[PDB]
Amino acid sequence: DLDELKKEVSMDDHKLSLDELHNKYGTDLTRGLTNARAKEILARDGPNSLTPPPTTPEWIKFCRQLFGGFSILLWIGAILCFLAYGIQAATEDEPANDNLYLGVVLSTVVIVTGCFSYYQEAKSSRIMDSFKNMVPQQALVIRDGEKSTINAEFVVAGDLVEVKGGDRIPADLRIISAHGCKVDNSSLTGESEPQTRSPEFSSENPLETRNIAFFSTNCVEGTARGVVVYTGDRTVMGRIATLASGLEVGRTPIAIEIEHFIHIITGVAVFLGVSFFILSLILGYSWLEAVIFLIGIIVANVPEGLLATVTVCLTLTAKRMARKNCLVKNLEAVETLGSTSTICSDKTGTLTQNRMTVAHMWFDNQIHEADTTENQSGAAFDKTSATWSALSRIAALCNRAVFQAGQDNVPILKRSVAGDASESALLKCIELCCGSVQGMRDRNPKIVEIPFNSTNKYQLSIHENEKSSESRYLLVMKGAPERILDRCSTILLNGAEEPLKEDMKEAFQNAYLELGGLGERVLGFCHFALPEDKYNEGYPFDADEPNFPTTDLCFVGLMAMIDPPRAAVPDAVGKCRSAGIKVIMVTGDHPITAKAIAKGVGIISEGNETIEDIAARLNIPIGQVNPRDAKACVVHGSDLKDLSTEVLDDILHYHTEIVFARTSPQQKLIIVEGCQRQGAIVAVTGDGVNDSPALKKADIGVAMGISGSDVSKQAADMILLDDNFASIVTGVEEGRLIFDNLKKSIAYTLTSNIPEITPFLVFIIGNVPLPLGTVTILCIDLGTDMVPAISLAYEQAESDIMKRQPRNPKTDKLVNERLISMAYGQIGMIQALGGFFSYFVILAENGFLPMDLIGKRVRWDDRWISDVEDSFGQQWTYEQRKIVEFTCHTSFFISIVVVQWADLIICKTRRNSIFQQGMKNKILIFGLFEETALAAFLSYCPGTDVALRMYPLKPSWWFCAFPYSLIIFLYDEMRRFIIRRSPGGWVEQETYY
């Protein structure tokens, strides 16, 4: 699957002849292939079906999640536990089973976290399947001179294939004979434009010529014949589907951030481990003691509950987004939005409302205004000229939409109309001041209609004339004003006709620019009376050859219409500009209108200017001005069809407000691939399959939901349900919000690591009784700290997030050294000191003063010394001193909770004060209450000395950690104060996360 040979622009053999192509495929133009030859090729080339994707079994990635940084350390912990158990079982009789339990539990922790990571790294991709639902089941092939419908997979290169309006093109064909055949290249051109397929050649670009039908498209109307030039994975839609399924996924920003800290955490873990293991044997420690050490140190360093906290945090924000109408398929896409700095959106159906209303009209060299208000409370437009009547007949006849059955009750403007928004707006205006269109339509029977063509750029039809004294034929046609202007020679002025001298041609140009500058879309309507002498009432004008005079028509007048903007569109554009997200308008209407919509939504800020605007303000040629004095620019599609790569790089590198008009959504992908290249996260907004290769390679693909197709939505990462644009801004804000909270929660979880690491370290350097066991640790990181860390996600904003520029990926991170200096360096140190305080207090009250504790470990752990003298001379048996050590573990754990109170409060806000933000987060309050209730339950419940080894505490001990907690609160409060008064100083570049 060579990607570079698939990234290249398609080439072809279109510029050929009918004789030169059969030879290339061994076929007959009037008899097709033979059945024997057909099967010989069917076996030579393979079936005409897209290849299935390479797949990934599920136990592979689950087993992968079981091996990754924190899990390897916990694995070596379980292994060590079983090693120490084996040693005990082979060296001593009646071996307590404490170590085997601790090991089975560590293995359980690894197994469950794995599940949380599997849930986070999901890749729900069924691309090729959506594509497979494309190709009809059976095609119509002509072999040996006979017509047969065979399994499309059985079509080969060379046979003759016939198509009919409504059927799907089974392969890439070379049209040989057509009969008014039209195709819908929505998949390559991105447009529902009905391109006609003619046997003749018309453009050097194979995608633009008409003598080629393409797989993945459908013949809207007409019938055609053709030779098969491409089949299978080689068709056009074949490179589209193979390219979509082939793109290596990669690694989202939040993933790279989660990797960076596992690296740092592991650094301090191995540094402390290999070093103290060598130290343990440099001091004479035996093997069964060093193994216990190693384990305690590994558990102490690894935050056994973090990763699962992150996975939850992210799940909560995804539910908030679904409440705001943004549904996310992949968990990490929640954060990719905040880190975005470039957006490629569309104007039709997202910014605008697409609901069209008739605003202005041109006729009798005079602009007329129509009432465009809900309750119809305004000014009429003078319905007394014949011109208006002819206009009503043109629009009311040359229009295929009709009100939805059963609307006889609603008003003329609020009823449902089945069709495009332009035909609907025209139908409503005619039904508004011209009465019932249904009778106006039955009053003139439509004989033949030639639907809209992407090449003809017009809709025409010849209906009968209701004239009782004139039994002739009427022809009407509508289309772009330029195309229609080129097809006339008379003008219906006040009823009579007149020539098309340049005076009215210039009045028509000024009228076109008047309606265009108003942000409206204009259309031209013309008609002509066919002479009944050259086309009698019996002659049938089949839509095949030139039966109607394309030129010499009678232009009656232009018809504009309004598409207003959405409520939040101006606000959303302002929000994007405030944040620093480069917006890029890509649409498919005329640039004269595109500029107006740009000025109307914000893309072109009130003040910026284009090179043409400067040339017009200084009435000088455009080749003289310097392109650096122009902030914005309107790039045309044709000029995009003929543009190199580096040029596009410079186009995006030198302009802040770019707008692309006359663009075929194919080119879109090109612009997206040009936006990612410079170094910025890219999002995109799409609706169909032409956007599939663009949504897949973008950092984040935003697909529409109501108007979008299964292919586009199933291949994207984020789906919108209201098709609005304000939701994009909301997504970016929520992506930032869930980021600052992850920082706070990480500092939280980390801070308590020091009070768990230090007891062990003093255990080896000073030789004092073990202060904090391993079971107590697991009870701290897996118990009391989970709920608070989860609550830290519900924190609201402090300042304005939608105002700062996007974070830099190469310099700003998630876990820097500032946080390490706070959690590991300052707060954690105070918490460790408080724990040691409560420790020494418990031992001093029972008889072991601090001077006699240094050096006692060798005998304090000796299981056969039933006489250990304390500071007062009392003799303590082994189990009696062990009970006190366990009670010291219980109080150490409670001290941890007490200091965690002030840590959760100083972690709530990063800069602001508590008396400003406020304790409005009910989850945090519930976390504190539950955190205390759990510690009291674990200590006071009967039988906890048989299970967890935790004895009850005497009410005077619980108050040994209070001063340290208040001190932590005061220190962080004064910390978060100099930052506010001294911006850019020492406290900021040293302690500001």
Binding site: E92, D93, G825, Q826, M829, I830, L833, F836, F837, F840, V841, A844, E845, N846, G847, L849, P850, W864, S866, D867, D870, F872, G873, Q874, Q875, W876, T877, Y878, E879, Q880, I883, V884, K954, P963, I967, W986, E990
Partner: protein, 294 residues
């Protein structure tokens, strides 16, 4: 990367900062940690002011006294060959370490030792737990009281010919008064004979019913010839108020011990404020695994 983040020569940076940054960070951490240390020390000094020097505030984790012995057994087993002398050396070195503290040379003069009843007697209260009266006085405990296990005659103490000794001792507790069982109809079988109220009885037996026969004649040595501890050596006033204090001892000779076979012997003290524990196998009683393999 590798080289630059280590030492660049344009900005004169090492590891990432200049000399003034490393100096400001180091100075800050030194002041911060210094304040932390001073605060912890102050909070520990107030703690030294909150406790008394003559008595432990909490005495509940040591209410039922233990029962230890003189030999140091790794797994509560005494195994030694009567031929190879380098087999019972680790034991004798201990026994000796324990008895070496009851030497008469140590116990001499009026201060701080006092001659007490050669026959078991009652308690003796030397006042309260104060410093008003000077260093209290403790009763003298002679070596010779232990007759065949004293290391004065047969230094080895028995281990030389298949007749080891075991010096039992009651764990020292401040203000603890031993209370023996009264003469009422409910009393164990053993305790009936020789009910000297003033003596806390110690009696050893076999863990299993079978082993009875294989254990021979348990001969106890003690103050007055009884198998117990005289109440006159109580209570204990603590190290600070009674340095140079000796706790009674009881010797136990396991004469007539079957050869080449593991014997489980459980010794137990009886009394009111004495209670055993199924978890702590040294609370009031003790177990020994003797095996004189020769």
């Amino acid at each position: 990367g590798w080289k630059k983040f280590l030492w660049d020569s344009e900005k004169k940076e090492f590891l990432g900062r200049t000399g003034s940054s490393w100096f400001k960070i180091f100075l800050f951490y030194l002041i911060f940690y210094g304040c932390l240390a001073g605060i912890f020390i102050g909070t520990i000094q107030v703690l030294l002011l909150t406790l008394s020097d003559f008595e432990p505030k909490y005495q509940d984790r040591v209410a039922p006294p233990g029962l230890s012995h003189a030999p140091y057994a790794i797994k509560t087993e005494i195994s030694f060959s009567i031929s190879n002398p380098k087999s019972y050396e680790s034991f004798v070195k201990s026994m000796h370490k324990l008895m070496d503290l009851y030497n008469e040379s140590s116990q001499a003069g009026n201060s701080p030792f006092e001659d007490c009843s050669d026959t078991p007697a009652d308690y003796i209260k030397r006042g309260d737990l104060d410093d008003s009266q000077g260093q209290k006085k403790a009763c003298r405990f002679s070596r010779m009281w232990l007759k065949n296990c004293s290391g004065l005659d047969d230094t080895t103490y028995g281990y030389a010919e298949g007749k080891p000794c075991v010096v039992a001792k009651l764990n020292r507790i401040i203000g603890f008064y031993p209370k023996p069982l009264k003469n009422t109809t409910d009393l164990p079988e053993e305790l009936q004979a020789n009910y000297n109220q003033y003596v806390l009885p110690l009696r050893c037996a076999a863990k299993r019913e079978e082993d009875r026969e294989k254990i021979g004649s348990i001969e106890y040595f003690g103050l007055g010839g009884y198998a117990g501890f005289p109440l006159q050596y109580y209570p204990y006033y603590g190290k600070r108020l009674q340095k140079k204090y000796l706790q009674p001892l009881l010797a136990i000779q396991f004469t007539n011990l079957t050869q080449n076979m593991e014997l489980r012997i459980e010794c137990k003290v009886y009394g009111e404020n004495i209670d055993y524990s199924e978890k702590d196998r040294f609370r009031g009683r003790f177990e020994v695994k003797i095996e004189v393999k020769s």
